[PDB]
Design a protein around this ligand. Structure first.
Ligand SMILES: [Zn+2]
Ligand SMILES: [Zn+2]
Ligand SMILES: [Zn+2]
Lengths: 224, 136, 52, 325, 141
RNA sequence: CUCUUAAGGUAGCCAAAUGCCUCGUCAUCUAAUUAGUGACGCGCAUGAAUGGAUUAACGAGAUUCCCACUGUCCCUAUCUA
RNA sequence: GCAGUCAAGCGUUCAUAGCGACAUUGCUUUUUGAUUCUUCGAUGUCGGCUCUUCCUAUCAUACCGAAGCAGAAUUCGGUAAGCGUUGGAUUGUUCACCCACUAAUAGGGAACGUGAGCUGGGUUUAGACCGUCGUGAGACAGGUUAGUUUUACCCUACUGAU
């Protein structure tokens, strides 16, 4: 359900958090109502993890993982990797990618069966992603906005893109992923969609400034 | 200093002061930024105020897109050359001073950032992380 | 909810006073002249603006 | 529809204060007309009119005694210089009238392409005559004839040579010719030969409804100095005059239009054309070294109007390449 | 294929755009911080007016330079890219001078909008103090 | 027609080293310009060998701007005789 | 320049929440004057830069009072001068007018602070050009350019040292 919250006072929860059907991630930001965006909406289904990777707080725009595996960047360290290992289940794998880029959550956009990757990624990461996730990868574009982990959110049953995406590109991505999508905004006209929110099989989280004509289309496109 | 600046920073050594002409890393059509003033930035006689990494500036464009120049605009510096210190002790520095154009509330105007970005800026302005390809 | 049986009690201590037009002091209603030596203990008072 | 008001009822009398009050009322009425026309089309199509009652009062004294006039119209674009509400105005009194409009400034177009405008009128029953402005300077059985072809007068848009064609009679410059069109004012009268007599027109303009936004109206109508735009009217300088002629005269190489997509395309618009020119001419800003192109617009445009660069308009409709240099 | 984000129904194009034309006209605005009524002073005897600090403009009634002095009258109109501020007719007797103004604004994210908004300049007669001071004589230079 | 004992600023040109009012008006240059460039001129009081205007070249002449440059400055520090 | 008393009235009704003419009692020496007491055997004369201190008639900051103070934002006043009160284009400028940041960009004085501390852009010599006047030399507090800024080793004061 579209549960609206604020991390500290910003609305981009896809920046400071992360969500999938095996683990949930959150930065150290207080404001216990934010943590109640998943402590209340779940039982003991999946574990929440309070982390600050690389001495940072933007875990969503630095980690691009999946239901069955995770990509953590090179700048991080074993001290923040070991908690992310121990307090998570062993059905999912954690691996420091040793590649040039760092902001995985703005070059990768992936769900449990399909993916979308930046065009100029190393061909070693091109294979490591499938070695650790077994997911198929399609590195062309979104609309010319080569950054994909910010202008695209993905469930398995629904995704979303930004307004300037062409009528040709929305149908191209529909054909690629075999999942519908809409050229929807988030948080009152902010087109950074994959960072202004996050979604899962049943759960959606957006900003407290977000509006009802966007909650209503989120509830349609992402759920079923 | 909280005009969209989410967190709160330590001191980063002030490399580029006013009168500086730093590149523009974003795809707004611009090419450079002439810094005129800095936010916060208290006063002292004959001290000209400076900008550190991750800070906001009021700035002006000199080269590119006549639609843009001849008016001031908020900007966000994301690369500098004066070597500063992370509290881990190691010192770092870039090769070029570079920034981004933004609105007063720290939100972006461009679609990307052509180049790397500082960790002190990404964690501080969150919308920069929503467009950053590389963080250092 | 104030239950104005207690609003009377409060207004006795907040909105039952008189103000010197020259000193801007909090003085009792019945008082003719001010309290302080700053104002020469003048008599120019007024009620406190409790209504509208 | 209407571009000049009516002027009746002098009636050989008195009351100076009132027989011009009736003209003040004839302006309250003609003025009401322009406001309704502007309100009638969309909401904004700014025309070059005049609100000063005195300049129109002046023109209300240079015809009734002038009694036979000749219309000077630039041959760069008579489509927007042809006056419309004069044949319906200077006829009714049944006295000495009949403008018999002309076209002039007629030596910057070539020989055979001048029939392009000679034929525009033989179909629609309009009078005319080709005679120049600067070059003479002391129905098919005619090609072109000099100045050989009771008051008289003359009228212009602004800048027709109402001070430069006064040499059509004597040629000694008793009115000063200027670069700006705003100098002509306070009507003038010239007199010679004891039976013919002139009445020179003060400065005028005449509004329009067509070619108002994306035009080229700034061809002979307005000053070039105090123009805050410097891009719009230059945008139709960047359209005609192909690149490989301007490339050959001033002798510079601007670019090759790497924006060959649909943002700019080909035949560059006036943003990529002037950037590699002020860098080659040396004019830079005051605070930073960059191309001060709006100060290059004022220069290249001043050569477009004075006679270094040329373009005439084919008469009646859309044609691709009628004029050739 | 998007939805307005305010009212839901109007689907807008992917040319770069924001919530509906209805809501962007109604709720959103770029013309606040200006009074629609601008008081100015005038002198009948010398037929010429001033800005409140400044030398008398000396320009006539219904002149081009009225645009300039009216723009100099301090509003926020000098912020947003004005264009085509010509005049609309008012009855001369009615002591009102109306200007039509057009700003081009920046929406939430890089989408530009036209505008059609109006302002009236109201004139009040003066006692012409400085010209009158010249008439008076307290000292000689 | 004339008035002043003769004539009545022609060509040209400008807030220019000549313009009190003057930080003249407009445009442009700048984030912002009493400066600067162009244009406008009833020009307090421009003007034709008391020479006018325009001029390539030249200048330890006066002035504005820009690329480069730099301890001129931010903000000082250090070395030598 | 600053402040006070009357209160004719403005202030949606509401003199004095704020304001407030008709009049009137004062305060100041940071304005311009007036006078000529000191200095004509010369007190080195504009501004800026650098630097210290003091004043309150407080712009900000602290605790407060008072409103036509619901909250927010503001106005009036008091104790109060302990700590701060800017970078910049234009101008030689004092003055000013803008741009921008800021808690704020308050006003002032110490021979109109400070030239054996600086600079010399200016005024105020001699060279020289233009305009007006003058027959003329020449005049202009009208405009423009160029034009030497001297000495401390003595007493006191101060910083430091025996
Ligand atoms: Zn009292
Ligand atoms: Zn709508
Ligand atoms: Zn007057």
């Amino acid at each position: 359900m579209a549960t609206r919250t604020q991390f500290e006072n910003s609305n981009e929860i896809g920046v400071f958090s992360k969500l999938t059907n095996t683990y949930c991630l959150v930065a150290v930001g207080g404001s216990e109502n934010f943590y109640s965006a998943f402590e209340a909406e779940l039982g003991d289904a999946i574990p929440i993890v309070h982390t600050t990777i690389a001495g940072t707080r933007i875990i969503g725009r630095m980690t691009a993982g999946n239901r069955r595996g995770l990509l953590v960047p090179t700048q991080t360290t074993d001290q923040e990797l070991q908690h992310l290992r121990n307090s998570l289940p062993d059905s999912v794998k954690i691996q420091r990618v040793e590649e040039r880029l760092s902001a995985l959550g703005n070059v990768i956009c992936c769900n449990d069966y399909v993916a979308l990757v930046h065009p100029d990624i190393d061909r070693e990461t091109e294979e490591l992603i499938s070695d650790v996730l077994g997911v198929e990868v399609f590195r062309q574009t979104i609309s010319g906005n080569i950054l994909v982990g910010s202008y695209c959110s993905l469930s398995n049953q629904g995704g979303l893109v930004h307004p300037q995406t062409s009528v040709q590109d929305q149908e191209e991505l529909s054909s690629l992923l075999q999942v519908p999508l809409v050229a929807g905004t988030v948080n009152r006209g902010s087109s950074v969609v994959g960072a202004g929110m996050v979604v899962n099989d049943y759960l959606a989280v957006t900003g407290l400034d977000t509006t009802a004509p966007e909650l209503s289309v989120i509830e349609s496109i992402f759920r079923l | 200093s909280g005009n969209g600046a989410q967190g709160t920073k330590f001191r980063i050594s002030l490399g580029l002061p006013v009168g500086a002409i730093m590149n523009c890393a974003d795809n707004s059509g611009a090419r450079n930024l002439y810094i005129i003033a800095v936010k916060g930035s208290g006063s002292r006689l004959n001290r000209l105020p400076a900008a550190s990494l991750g800070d906001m500036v009021m700035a002006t464009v000199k080269k590119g897109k006549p639609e843009l120049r001849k008016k001031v605009m908020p900007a966000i510096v994301v690369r500098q050359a004066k070597s500063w210190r992370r509290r881990d002790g190691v010192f770092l520095y870039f090769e070029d001073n570079a920034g981004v154009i933004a609105n007063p509330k720290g939100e972006m105007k461009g679609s990307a950032i052509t180049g790397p970005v500082g960790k002190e800026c990404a964690d501080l302005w969150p919308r920069v992380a929503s467009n950053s390809g590389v963080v250092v | 909810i104030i239950e104005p049986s207690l609003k009377a009690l409060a207004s006795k201590y907040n909105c039952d006073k008189s103000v010197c037009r020259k000193c801007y002091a909090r003085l009792p209603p019945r008082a003719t002249n001010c309290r302080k030596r700053k104002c020469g203990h003048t008599n120019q008072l007024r009620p406190k603006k409790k209504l509208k | 529809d209407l571009i000049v008001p009516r002027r009746p009822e002098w009636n050989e009398g008195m009351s100076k204060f009132q027989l011009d009050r009736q003209e003040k009322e004839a302006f309250l009425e003609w003025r009401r007309k322009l406001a309704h026309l502007q309100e009638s089309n969309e909401d904004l199509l700014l025309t070059p009119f005049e609100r000063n009652i005195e300049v129109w009062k002046q023109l209300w004294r240079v015809v009734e005694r002038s009694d036979l006039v000749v219309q000077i119209v630039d041959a760069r674009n008579p489509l927007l210089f042809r006056s419309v509400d004069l044949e319906r105005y200077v006829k009714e009194s049944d006295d000495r009238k009949a403008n018999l409009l002309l076209v002039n400034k007629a030596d910057l177009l070539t020989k055979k392409q001048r029939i392009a405008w000679a034929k525009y009128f033989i179909s629609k029953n309009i009078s005319f005559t080709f005679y120049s402005a600067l070059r003479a300077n002391q129905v098919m059985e005619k090609v072109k004839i000099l100045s050989i072809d009771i008051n008289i007068g003359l009228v212009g848009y602004p800048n027709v040579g109402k001070s430069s064609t006064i040499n059509s009679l004597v040629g000694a410059k008793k009115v000063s010719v200027s670069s700006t069109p705003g100098k002509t004012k306070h009507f003038q009268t010239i007199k010679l030969s004891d039976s013919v007599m002139l009445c020179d027109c003060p400065g005028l303009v005449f509004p329009n409804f067509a070619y108002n936004k994306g035009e080229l109206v700034c061809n002979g109508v307005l000053p070039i100095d105090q123009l805050r735009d410097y891009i719009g009217p230059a945008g139709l300088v960047a359209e005609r005059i192909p690149k490989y002629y301007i490339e050959a005269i001033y002798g510079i190489h601007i670019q090759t239009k790497s924006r060959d997509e649909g943002g700019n395309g080909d035949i560059p618009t006036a943003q990529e054309l002037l950037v590699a020119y002020a860098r080659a001419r040396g004019y830079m800003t005051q605070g930073y070294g960059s191309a001060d192109e709006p100060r290059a617009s004022r220069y290249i445009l001043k050569d477009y109007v004075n006679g270094k660069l040329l373009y005439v308009n084919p008469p009646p409709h859309l044609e691709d390449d009628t004029p050739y240099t | 294929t998007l939805l307005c984000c305010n009212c839901g129904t109007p689907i807008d194009g992917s040319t770069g755009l924001v919530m509906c034309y209805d809501c962007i006209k109604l709720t959103v605005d770029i013309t606040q911080g200006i009074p629609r009524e601008a008081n100015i002073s005038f002198c009948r005897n010398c037929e010429r007016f001033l800005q409140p600090p400044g030398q008398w403009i000396r320009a006539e009634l219904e002149s081009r330079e009225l645009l300039a002095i009216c723009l100099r009258r301090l509003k926020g109109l000098t912020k947003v890219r004005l264009v085509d501020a010509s005049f609309i007719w008012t009855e001369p007797h009615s002591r009102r001078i109306r200007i039509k103004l057009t700003v081009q604004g920046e929406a939430m994210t890089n989408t530009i909008i036209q505008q059609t908004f109006e302002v009236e300049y109201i004139v009040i007669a003066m006692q012409c103090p400085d010209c009158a001071r010249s008439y008076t004589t307290n000292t000689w230079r």
